[PDB]
């Protein structure tokens, strides 16, 4: 049933520390509106420099983050992310183009995709969550500065 499917997504999303304290009604909005995208080894989920207005939660598999830096022809490997982590918030919070590539590291990667309106009405409205992601993005900014991102 729909209710059971919803309960399953609820359990997973509550396991994502970012969403652990979100009010039930906002979590429900995410559950109703999320979409799921699958990727295989090497597929670019996000490309650096592109417009983007969606937020991703990694529901299965691993992805790597690459980014163009000074003195390097090719994007450099910054980190990998795994199930339970997230990405894509920076373009929304900063009102910017995508600031790094996100690349599937293995087959059958699955991301929960949340569009801009849902993000703003859920994650952008719960003050505690917005303030947190802002600290997160500011930290990303400092990291970019350190490695001299192009
Ligand atoms: N700028 C930046 N983005 C990062 C870093 N590590 C992970 N990311 C993620 O990569 C994403 C690329 O798209 P975004 O919308 O710019 O949001 C970014 C972050 O979620 C980092 O060190 N710097
Ligand atoms: Ca699931
Ligand atoms: Ca920028
Ligand atoms: Na994360």
Instruction: Spell out the alpha helix ranges (H) of the chain.
Output: 2-15, 24-33, 89-94, 116-121, 127-147
- Annotated binding residues, written as ranges, equal 79, 88-91, 98-99, 144, 147
Q: Whose CA is nearest to atom 21 of ligand 1?
A: 140
Indicate the SS3 state at residue 147: helix
Beta-carbon contacts of residue 30 (< 8 Å; ≥ 6 apart) = 13, 19, 22, 114, 118, 122
User: Torsion angle of alpha carbons 10, 12, 17, 22, nearest 10°?
Assistant: -10
Q: Which CATH number do you get for residue 124?
A: 2.60.120.10
What single string gives the DSSP state of each residue in 83-98?
TT-EE-HHHHHHT-S-
Q: How far is the CA of 75 from the centre of ligand 3 (A)?
A: 16
Edge-to-edge strands, sheet with 55-60: 35-39, 109-114, 55-60, 86-87
Beta-sheet pairing, 101-104 with 109-114: unpaired
CA 58 to ligand 4 centroid distance, Å: 9
Sign, CA dihedral 28-86-140-102, equals negative
Domain that holds residue 121: 1-150
Number of domains in the chain: 1
**Declared resolution, Å:** 1.9
Residue ranges around ligand 1 (CB below 6 Å): 46, 52, 65, 78-79, 87-91, 98-100, 102, 140, 143-144
Experimental method: X-ray
How many other C-beta atoms are found inside a 10 Å radius of the C-beta of residue 142? 9
Q: How far is the CA of 85 from the centre of ligand 4 (A)?
A: 4
């Amino acid at each position: 049933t729909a209710q059971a499917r919803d309960e399953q997504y609820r359990n997973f999303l509550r396991s994502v520390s970012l969403l652990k304290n979100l009010p039930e009604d906002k979590l429900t909005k995410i559950i109703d509106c999320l979409e799921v995208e699958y990727y295989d080894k090497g597929d670019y989920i996000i490309r650096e420099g592109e417009e983007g207005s969606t937020f991703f939660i990694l529901a299965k598999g691993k992805v790597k983050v690459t980014q163009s830096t000074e003195g390097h022809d090719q994007p450099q490997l910054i980190k990998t992310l795994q199930k339970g982590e997230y990405f894509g918030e920076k373009a929304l919070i900063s009102d910017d183009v995508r600031s790094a590539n996100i690349i599937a590291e293995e087959n059958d990667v699955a991301c929960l995709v949340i569009d801009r309106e849902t993000f703003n009405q859920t994650v952008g409205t719960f003050e505690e969550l917005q303030k947190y992601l802002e600290g997160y993005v500011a930290n990303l900014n400092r990291d970019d500065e350190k490695r001299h991102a192009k």
